[PDB]
Ligand binder design. Structure first.
Ligand SMILES: CC(=O)N[C@@H]1[C@@H](O)[C@H](O)[C@@H](CO)O[C@@H]1O
Ligand SMILES: CC(=O)N[C@@H]1[C@@H](O)[C@H](O)[C@@H](CO)O[C@@H]1O
Lengths: 141, 141
């Protein structure tokens, strides 16, 4: 089993994001998104799968944060500027079919940040980046 | 916009189900799964999409409950006895690719029930079953 426990930090009162979708990819016997003490917990059956959280703000901004384990190490990626047909389940699957997404996954990043077209920054940092009980902060700018 | 507000009723203390995944299909400008007063709310950009909730009990049982709108009329379906590679996002997409699932959607049911292999009943009943503001009970036996 691998577990990724995500704490969401919102740093910027000019918006408020909330989770609108939580998906689990089918490899490695799948897994679950649960909630413990306000943290999003992705539990997976082994290495090689992942799960996507999609967040939406009132003003129409949105992003996906995806977390998983590739070759026994954590990975993460953020996709923003989402098209109206890019739901979380679309994004999640693309990590196993679309080359640019596959490559992002295979980099096994413990830390990644990117901005949307409005200039808002989004960041994932694993504070526990080793072993089977992984912990990450999702930091919204 | 179409909205489907879902109330979950668990009636049998021999199990406890909890939501482990919530997906939104890409058609009709997608949508969101939000929470209001312990109710799961699927808000969709128009007719022709859906979203899936997957529930797991710690005794191993699981199922998906899918809710959507097809040619302006609500639909629903439940899939039980899930394989370990049948996550909610796999199931949700099957309503637009796998014949038996497409047919279930096309039925435009205001209510649907099915039992799993252990004999547990699962039912969806739309108590507000017309118009753009739809309300459904998900009743676990
Ligand atoms: C602005 C934006 O969302 N860029 C994303 C990038 O962060 C991500 O690594 C990628 C591959 O999945 O596709 C996009 O380039
Ligand atoms: C036991 C069980 O899950 N049966 C289902 C049924 O509920 C359903 O509507 C369908 C089409 O999606 O697939 C399966 O036949």
């Amino acid at each position: 089993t691998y577990k990724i426990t995500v704490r969401v930090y919102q740093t910027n009162p000019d918006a408020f994001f909330h989770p609108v979708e939580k998906t689990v990819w089918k490899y490695a016997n799948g897994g679950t998104w649960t909630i413990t003490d306000d943290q999003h917990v992705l539990t997976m059956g082994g290495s090689g799968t992942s799960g996507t959280l999609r967040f939406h703000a009132d003003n129409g901004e949105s992003f996906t944060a995806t977390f998983g384990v590739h070759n026994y190490k954590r990975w993460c990626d953020i996709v923003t500027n989402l098209a109206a047909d890019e739901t979380g389940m679309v994004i999640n699957q693309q990590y196993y079919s679309q080359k640019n997404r596959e490559e992002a996954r295979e980099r096994q990043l413990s830390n990644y940040q990117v901005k949307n077209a409005k200039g808002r920054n989004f960041q994932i940092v694993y504070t526990e980046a080793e072993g089977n009980d992984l912990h990450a902060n999702l930091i919204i700018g």
